[PDB]
Nucleic acid binder design. Sequence first.
RNA 1: GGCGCGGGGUACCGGGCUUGGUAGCCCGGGGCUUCGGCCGAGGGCGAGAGCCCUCGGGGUUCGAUUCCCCCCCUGCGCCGC
RNA 2: GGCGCGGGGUACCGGGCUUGGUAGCCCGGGGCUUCGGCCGAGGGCGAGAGCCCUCGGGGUUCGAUUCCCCCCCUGCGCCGC
Lengths: 236, 236
Amino acid sequence: DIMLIILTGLPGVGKSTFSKNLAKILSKNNIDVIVLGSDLIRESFPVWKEKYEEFIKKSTYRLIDSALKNYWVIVDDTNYYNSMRRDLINIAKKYNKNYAIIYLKASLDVLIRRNIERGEKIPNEVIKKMYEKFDEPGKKYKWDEPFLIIDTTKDIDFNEIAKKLIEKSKEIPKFNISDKIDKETRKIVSEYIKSKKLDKDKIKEVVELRKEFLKKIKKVDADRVLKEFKDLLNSY
Amino acid sequence: DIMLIILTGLPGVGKSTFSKNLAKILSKNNIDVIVLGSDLIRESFPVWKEKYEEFIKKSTYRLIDSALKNYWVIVDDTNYYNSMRRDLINIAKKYNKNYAIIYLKASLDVLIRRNIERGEKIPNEVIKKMYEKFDEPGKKYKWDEPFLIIDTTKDIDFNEIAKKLIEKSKEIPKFNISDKIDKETRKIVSEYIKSKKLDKDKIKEVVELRKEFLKKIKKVDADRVLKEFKDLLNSY
RNA sequence: GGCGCGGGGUACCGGGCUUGGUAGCCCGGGGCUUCGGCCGAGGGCGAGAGCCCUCGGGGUUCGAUUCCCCCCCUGCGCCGC
RNA sequence: GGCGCGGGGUACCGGGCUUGGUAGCCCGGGGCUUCGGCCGAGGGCGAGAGCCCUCGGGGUUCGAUUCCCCCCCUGCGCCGC
Ligand SMILES: Nc1ncnc2c1ncn2[C@@H]1O[C@H](COP(=O)(O)OP(=O)(O)OP(=O)(O)O)[C@@H](O)[C@H]1O
Ligand SMILES: Nc1ncnc2c1ncn2[C@@H]1O[C@H](COP(=O)(O)OP(=O)(O)OP(=O)(O)O)[C@@H](O)[C@H]1O
Ligand SMILES: [Mg+2]
Ligand SMILES: [Mg+2]
C-alpha cells in the first residue's frame, strides 16, 4: 500500500514542518516513508547559483523515482505550477502507485506575516509574485484535485490525516448491423429525396416513414431488410 | 579541474563541520562543490531501520556518481574500511577525476570525549569498536594514502587546505633476437652437458665459454650465430 | 582485517619481458672509462695487481633468477555490509 | 496561466461508437408499463385525450446530432523552468 504524497503550497506555509510531523506519525503506524524535496540537494552546495538548478531537479526526481519503488515518499516542495504536480504524478503513474495532493493553504497576508517572521529571507514581493502565479490545485485538471486542504493558521490533526491517508493507500490506483441498416436507410432516403424531387412535405413523410420502418425491425437480415425498405417507399 | 574529495575518520572527529567550512572556502574561490553523505538520506526517513541501509547506500552513491560529472564532491562519510574508499575511488576512476583522501584524525580518547560531549548519542563502545575496526589510510594500499591528515583538536587552516587542493586538481589523474640467441645457447649447453657426460669442472667451462661467446656477439644472424656456437664447443 | 595474487629478494638505480646453464634482453634514469667497454655490498688473504667466500632460509638439482615450501620488501584482487 | 485538443450542449441518468434524413446503436445504471413497449424540460391552446412552439447563438442546407465560426459545460495535451 505505497503512495506518493504531493505536498503543495507557497513558501512560509509550513510544508517542511508538516512533512516531518506527518512522517513521524505515519511511521508511528509502522509505515516506511521518506521525506524528499529539492532543498535536500539545493542546500548541500555552499552557495546558490542558478546553474545548480538543472542538477538539483534531475537529482531530486531520480531520488523520488527511486524511493517510491520501496517507500511512501512525502514530496516537500512548493509545487506551484500544475505541470509540476503532473511531473510528480507521472512517477507515481510509472509505478502504478496512489497519490495524494495536500494543499497546505494560507491567505497571502498570513504568508506575508510568516515570511517577515522568518526575517524575510525571501523578498516579500516574491511571495506575492509566487501568489499571483500559483496554480490552484484542481482549477484546471481533475487529476490535480487536492486530496486534502490543510489550514496552517489553525491547529492541525495528524492522527486524522494519517487515518485518512492509509485508507487512501488501500485503493488500487485509478489510471455493426443496426448501424449499417440505419446509415444505409439514411442513404436510400437521400437518394429518393434527391432523385424523386419530393417537396418539403413528402420529404418529412418518407423521413418519418423511415423512422417507423426502423421501429418495426427492432421488434433481421440486412440485405433482406433494405429491399424491404426500398419496397416500402416505392409503394408509398 | 574537478575532483572527488574522500573524507575519512571516525564519528565525533568533525567531518561534517569540516566539510561545510571546506566547501564554503572552496566556493569562496569560485569552485562549484557539493557536500554529499549517506546521512543526507538516512535522516530523511523519520526513523532508522536496518532495511533502509540498502537504499541509503545505492542512493548516496548514485548521488555522488551523478554530481561528480559536473562538480567537486566532498564525501562526508566515516569511510572506515578501505573497500569503502575504493568504492568511492572507483567513481572518480570511472570519470577520470582526481581524488584526495582527507584523514580527519584524532586519538580514541579525544573521540570518546567528543561523543560524551555530544550526549553519547552512540554507545561509547561503538566508537571504540569502530576504532579497533578502522582501516588506517595507506596501511595496505598505496592508492589509499591520505592526501592530508587533519588534527581536529588543533586549530585548522582552510586557506591552506584550499590552496593545496586546487593545486592537486591541476594534475591529470594517475590511473626477440638476443633472447632467442640466449635461450637457444642455453639449450645447446644443456645438450652438450647432458650428452657429452662432462664433469662438474668442464661443466663450468662450457658455461663460462657460453657467457664469453655471448659477449663477443653483442659487439648478427641467429642461425649463423648458433652454428658458430655449436662449432665453438666442438673445438674446445 | 580475512583469504589471495603479481613483481623483487644477482650485483649502478627504476620498470617490463624471457629463461633449469652460474643468468639474459628491452625501455627509462645515473656513473666510470682513451679505444673497447665497464659498475653493487659484507667478510678473508694480498704493499699492489689481483685471488677466495657470501648475497633471506630451506629442497628438487651437476647446476635455481627460473620449479617447490617458509619469510622479508613491493604493488595489487576480491571481501570484511 | 498560454496555446490547443476530445466529449456534451436531443430529450431517463452515465460512458463509448456510427451518421447531412428530423437521429441511431453498443455497455453500465434507473423509471413507468398488461401485452407491446415506453420516458426529459419551458411556454401556448385544450375539462380531457390530445395539438402547436422551443432546446445556447450564428451559417452552409430542403433538412445540422454530424460540416463551419462564436460561446457554455466536461475531460484532457503540451508548456509556463
Ligand atoms: N503554524 C505556524 N505558525 C507560525 N509559523 C509557522 C507555522 N508553520 C510554519 N511556520 C514558520 O514558517 C517558517 C518556515 O518553516 P517551514 O519549513 O515549516 O516552512 P515551509 O513553508 O515548509 O518552507 P518552504 O518555503 O520550503 O515551503 C518557519 O520558520 C516556521 O517557524
Ligand atoms: N574541534 C572540535 N572541538 C570540539 N568539538 C568538536 C570539534 N569538531 C567537531 N566537534 C563536535 O563533534 C560533534 C559532531 O559534529 P560533526 O558533524 O562536526 O561531527 P562528525 O564526526 O563529522 O560526525 P560523523 O559522526 O558523521 O563523523 C559536534 O557536536 C561538534 O560540536
Ligand atoms: Mg522548508
Ligand atoms: Mg555529521
